Amino acid sequence: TSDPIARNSDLVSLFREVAATAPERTALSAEDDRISYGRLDAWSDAVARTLLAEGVRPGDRVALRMSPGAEAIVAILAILKCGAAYVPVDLRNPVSRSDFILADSGASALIGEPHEGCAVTRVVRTAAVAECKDAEPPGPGAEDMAYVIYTSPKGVPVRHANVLALLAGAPSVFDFSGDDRWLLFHSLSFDFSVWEIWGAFSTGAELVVLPHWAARTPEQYLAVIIDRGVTVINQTPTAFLALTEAAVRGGRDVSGLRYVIFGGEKLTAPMLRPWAKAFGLDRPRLVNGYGITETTVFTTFEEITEAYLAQDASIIGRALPSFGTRVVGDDGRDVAPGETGELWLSGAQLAEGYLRRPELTAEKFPEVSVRYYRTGDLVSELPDGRFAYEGRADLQIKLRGYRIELSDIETAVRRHDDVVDAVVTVREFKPGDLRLVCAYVAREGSATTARELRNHIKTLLPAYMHPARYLPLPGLPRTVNGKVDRAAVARSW
């Protein structure tokens, strides 16, 4: 085969081939600074030498604390070239979380800027990375770790082969080429960034760095994606709401985009209809992606169609080629098609397990012989094999003599045309009087009363599942990993 993705078994061999083949092509740009693949390859080899001198060796975990930018990408490549795995430290971590990640991962060096009180001593600072930039021109194997990203905190080691499997699966859904330009946006601590970086590099495309000046507003974001000829962007549904409003109000031309890829959050039609109204569904194509750190970024995709806009649920679509699936009931047996159950996943994109958590790993990665990962997500299979996303599987509570599926109440609230987000919690009204309540986010340009939401829910659910009060918020508060902060919601009440 001529295909570098199919032919290489690790990310370093892949990158080296893609660079050596056409080294003058642009790999990375930051404003007008264009860094060719050849330049990036030499630069990251020089930084790898610097890491070797700090005693980094194959199998090590090297911490990385940098904002997404050219130096950070050089640092990742250098770490991988040393046969080591990178452990990204979210810049916004509380100090204690960063301390735990560094301890738990056994990180033996850090590249970038240490957090205040950082216990890792062997540091290659960002400035030392930049110093290697224009100097001249043992490697990992498939089963070597490429990164350890922390979730919830549990460390998830993902191997070179896991990432290659994802990359080999992408073309079943996307038409990418080396003429695309991908925006690097997400924190290196989020696996969305693994996809932004390797989607670009695996295809010989250009990774465009969002400048620091453009970090704050959707107007600034749009200005850059249009100025720099970006063709692929990856966004949370939440970010997409802000992007749409800015594009529409600002009269911007979005039609240079080829793909907008959503991930991380439930996507429903009220989040999509305003963009589709202004811009249609072809240029760019919009594609909902569902996935998990434990199964290498993306598992299923659903390209958005008119049919998506006409229904009120969330459809995550079909699994990539590497995957086997089950939808599993409480009794541990498969549900009947159409029934809601827990998604279980198998295949080459599954991580090996968690780092130093044998107990959790055995529970979350059972064998059935086929090895599975229990997603903790409830889904249902549609007649055609596409999956609908329901909610997290840990949201049943006991209240007032009932078991109550909070995920079902959230889904029902999300069916309302003017709602873009919702969370249901329990709060105390008077002393011994606890009741369901719902905080929600209105679609921009709408306002819905609690009475109207009550009337909506009356048609869908029995009374014991009705929220007693509704609270509109200008967005729900999010945790570190970007999940809804149910404790912060409680405080907002």
Ligand X SMILES: Nc1ncnc2c1ncn2[C@@H]1O[C@H](COP(=O)(O)O)[C@@H](O)[C@H]1O
- Residues engaged in binding ligand X (CB under 6 A): 151, 191, 263-267, 288-293, 316, 375, 377, 389, 392, 481
**Nearest approach, Cβ of 353 to ligand X (angstroms)?**
15
Q: Cα–Cα distance between 232 and 200 in angstroms, integer?
A: 9
Q: What's the closest the beta carbon of residue 317 comes to ligand X, in angstroms? A: 9
- Look up residue 484 and give its DSSP letter: B
Which residue's CB is nearer to ligand X, number 10 or number 377?
Answer: 377
- Spatial CA neighbour of 249 closest among 100, 444, 413, 89: 444
Pick the closer one to ligand X by CB: 394 or 452. Answer: 394
We find the least distance from the C-beta atom of residue 256 to ligand X, in angstroms, to be 25
Rounded least distance, CB 341 to ligand X, Å: 15
- What minimum distance in Å lies between the beta carbon of 364 and ligand X? 12
**Paired residues of 157 in beta bridges:** 148
Closest CB to ligand X among 122 and 357?
357
Do 493 and 434 meet the contact criterion of CB atoms below 8 Å apart?
Answer: no
CB closer to ligand X, 98 vs 299:
299
Distance between CA 416 and CA 270 in Å, rounded? 8
**Alpha-carbon distance 84 to 270, whole Å?**
43
Using the minimum distance from each CB to ligand X, give the nearer residue, 37 or 354: 354
Contact call for residues 344 and 326 (beta carbons, < 8 A): yes
The four Cα atoms 89, 91, 96, 102 give a dihedral, to 10 degrees, of 20
Q: What secondary structure letter does DSSP report for 103?
A: H
Name the minimum Å distance from CB 236 to ligand X: 9
Please say whether the dihedral angle defined by the alpha carbons of residues 390, 392, 397 and 403, taken in this order, is positive or negative: positive
Q: DSSP class of residue 90?
A: -
Q: Which is nearer to ligand X, 374 or 454 (CB)?
A: 374
d(CA 301, CA 487): 31
Per DSSP, 212 falls in state: G
Q: In the bound complex, what is the minimum distance in angstroms from residue 191's beta carbon to ligand X?
A: 6
Question: How many angstroms separate the CA atoms of 106 and 214, rounded?
Answer: 35
* Closer to ligand X by Cβ: residue 126 or 314: 314
